[PDB]
Design a protein around this nucleic acid. Structure first.
Ligand SMILES: [Mg+2]
Ligand SMILES: [Zn+2]
Lengths: 47, 52, 45, 516
RNA sequence: GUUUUCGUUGUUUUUU
């Protein structure tokens, strides 16, 4: 469902203030485990 | 993922209504509760129940 | 006394209760308590 | 221990003052030995002892006090810091005691840091006034103290923690003139403040504090309640009248303008108002990459939403996001376990502010500028103390340098130390820098030695920073004073700083121009 | 100091 629409039908004279958000492409990242002290490292299954 | 994402697309609506009336300079990085698709999978794979 | 050894970098060392789990040179948080040099006796049967 | 708990102490001072003045009734009622008394009207003639010793502001303020006394009730006497408030009040009290118009004991409430001070001006300006502090001296013992504390006793002193130690036999009997030297420990209603304070039985009610309004007009209403019985209205009335309109605000201004000037005219004759250079440089540093990582990690977590929905308070989620801005190493679970026994807990350049700390402080270290380092937490003091000890080590190992010589003061130390350290900074060419943690420090400590000031973390109260700057910007400071604000851009520091600016506007359009 | 202090829900797999 790639369509997300909002509106403010009233005034702004009369108007459809149309907040409209369109979806797009996804992103895939390589495993990285991001330690809790900012010492981010790429994660290995053994670890 | 269908289930969890169908409860993902909607929390954008249920936050861009409380701010649309203020029409603030919404960050848009705070209405996206990203742990939406973490916990359903965690519970399904950990407890064993495929749902919520 | 209580000696410690790193993951695979072979760093040998010793933490105390003042520092977090972190191999001091390699920066490896998978550390291992170094084995005791103490003798263990067996029955060979 | 100057006091009049035992009548012997009273008698000695009384005799000494009688002999001093000498060269039917209570002798002091006679005029000055060499001049006359100042008769303002029939019921008020100030003794010649103190009347010419006052000056313009002081004289007209005692005049204001007498005007309120005649008009009955009282007012919140608050002006610029220490503008002869004590002198004015005691001179006025001596004025009423002089004309025999004091027919009932006077009560004065003061902090525990000025208890002996408040008894001192009584002793020195007006020895005829007897005085009794609310302590072991001035459970039966306090009852024999009560014996003849109303007839013999003239003025009773109380610490504003000590009333609820002996309130059983204080709030019962009637009272005359009432003084409270505390305008920031009353604030808004609904507290132990109202429980032990506003139950006093006397129209005469005066508060001595130049900073009554720092948070909101609810504090204004609660402070007006103590002096006057409600010339404005009830708390619901006070709110529904002008609370929202002032905040939101044309459509607000003009109606709001009149509704506010009405309040200004209603409360203006119930509280007096009187008021080198300074440089305010604010640096906007950025969050470091390890800081941004820990910022996003905490940013997207269950605990924040859990706080938002209501099971917890936002006060514990903005204290931890300020915990990371000071430096990354403060959001650790082992904080106490490595604070002072792990020399890597502090570190440098990870906070995003060490560099603008190292550079800025070393630009004065060789320049010899006594500067003020300011925090709010004693936990960050550990980090800035490890950092400065490492700086000391580096400087001492090499040459052509000088020890940094810091010190830390807080609630952990004792009330006895105070002035000593407060002094060792002014009167020593060494001891260049010292952290202060501007909550404990700012009660009036004299640190005119400082010329530079560093603000590290923004606070919540917009007022706590003015005393901080006043720790080096005292009245008539010897040399120019500068302020360097630390501010992490794109963080909660932005929101707080804008909030503090809005708060400054609040007290800068209510009292300056309601059209803003 | 004789004496002396652990538990459950749910889930899976099991055992002639
Ligand atoms: Mg069987
Ligand atoms: Zn290692």
């Amino acid at each position: 469902e790639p369509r997300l629409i909002l509106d403010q039908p009233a005034q702004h004279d009369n108007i459809n203030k149309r907040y409209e958000i369109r979806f797009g492409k996804i992103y895939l990242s390589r495993p990285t485990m991001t330690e809790a002290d900012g010492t981010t490292h790429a994660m290995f299954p053994q670890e | 993922f269908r289930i969890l994402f169908r409860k993902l697309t909607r929390e954008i609506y249920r936050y861009m209504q409380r701010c649309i009336e203020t029409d603030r300079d919404f960050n848009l990085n705070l209405a996206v509760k990203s742990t939406t698709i973490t916990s359903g999978l965690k519970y399904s794979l950990a407890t064993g129940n495929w749902g919520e | 006394g209580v000696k410690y050894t790193c993951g695979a970098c072979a760093h040998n060392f010793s933490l105390n209760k003042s520092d977090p789990v972190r191999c001091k040179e390699c920066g490896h948080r998978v550390i291992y308590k170094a084995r005791t040099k103490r003798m263990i006796q067996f029955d060979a049967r | 221990n100057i006091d009049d708990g035992d009548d012997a102490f009273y008698n000695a001072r009384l005799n000494a003052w009688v002999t001093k003045r000498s060269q039917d009734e209570e002798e002091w009622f006679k005029p000055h030995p060499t001049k006359q008394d100042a008769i303002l009207d029939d019921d008020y003639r100030l003794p010649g002892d103190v009347y010419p010793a006052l000056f313009d502001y002081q004289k007209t303020c005692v005049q204001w006090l007498w005007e309120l006394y005649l008009q009955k009730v009282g007012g919140i006497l608050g002006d610029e810091m220490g503008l002869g408030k004590t002198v004015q009040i005691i001179s006025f009290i001596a004025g009423l005691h002089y004309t025999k118009k004091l027919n009932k004991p006077v009560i004065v409430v003061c902090p525990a840091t000025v208890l002996r001070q408040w008894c001192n001006e009584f002793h020195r300006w007006w020895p005829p006034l007897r005085v009794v502090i609310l302590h072991a001296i001035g459970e039966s013992r306090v009852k024999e103290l009560i014996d003849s504390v109303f007839t013999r006793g003239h003025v009773i002193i109380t610490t504003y923690v000590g009333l609820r130690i002996y309130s059983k036999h204080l709030l019962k009997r009637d009272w005359g003139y009432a003084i409270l030297d505390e305008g920031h420990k009353i604030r808004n209603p609904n507290s132990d403040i109202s429980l032990t304070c506003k139950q006093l039985r006397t129209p005469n009610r005066v508060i001595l504090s130049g900073t009554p309004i720092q948070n909101n007009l609810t504090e204004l209403w609660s402070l007006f309640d103590f002096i006057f019985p409600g010339r404005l209205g009830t708390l619901p009335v006070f709110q529904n009248q002008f609370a929202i309109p002032i905040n939101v605000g044309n459509l607000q201004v003009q109606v709001g303008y009149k509704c506010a000037v009405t309040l200004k005219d209603l409360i203006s004759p119930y509280l007096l108002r009187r008021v080198p250079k300074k440089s305010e440089m604010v640096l906007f540093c950025k969050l470091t990459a390890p800081q941004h990582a820990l910022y996003e990690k905490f940013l997207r977590s269950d605990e924040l939403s859990r706080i938002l929905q209501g099971k917890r308070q936002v006060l514990y989620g903005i204290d931890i996001l300020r915990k990371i801005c000071n430096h990354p190493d403060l959001v650790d679970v082992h904080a106490k376990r490595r604070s002072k026994k792990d020399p890597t807990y502090g570190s440098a350049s990870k906070s995003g502010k060490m560099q603008v700390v190292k550079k800025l402080l070393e630009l004065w270290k060789s320049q010899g500028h006594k500067t003020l380092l300011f925090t709010q937490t004693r936990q960050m003091l550990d980090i800035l103390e490890s950092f400065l000890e490492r700086l000391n080590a580096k400087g001492a190992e090499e040459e052509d340098f000088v020890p940094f010589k810091f010190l830390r003061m807080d609630g952990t130390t004792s009330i006895g130390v105070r002035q000593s350290l407060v002094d060792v900074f002014n009167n020593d060419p060494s001891y260049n820098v010292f952290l202060l943690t501007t909550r404990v420090g700012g009660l009036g400590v004299n640190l005119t030695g400082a010329n530079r000031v560093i603000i590290y973390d923004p606070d919540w109260n917009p007022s706590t920073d003015v005393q901080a700057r006043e720790r080096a910007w005292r009245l008539g400071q010897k040399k120019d004073v500068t302020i360097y604000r630390l501010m992490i851009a794109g963080s909660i520091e932005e929101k707080i700083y804008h909030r503090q600016i809005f708060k400054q506007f609040l007290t800068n359009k209510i009292l300056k121009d309601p059209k803003q």
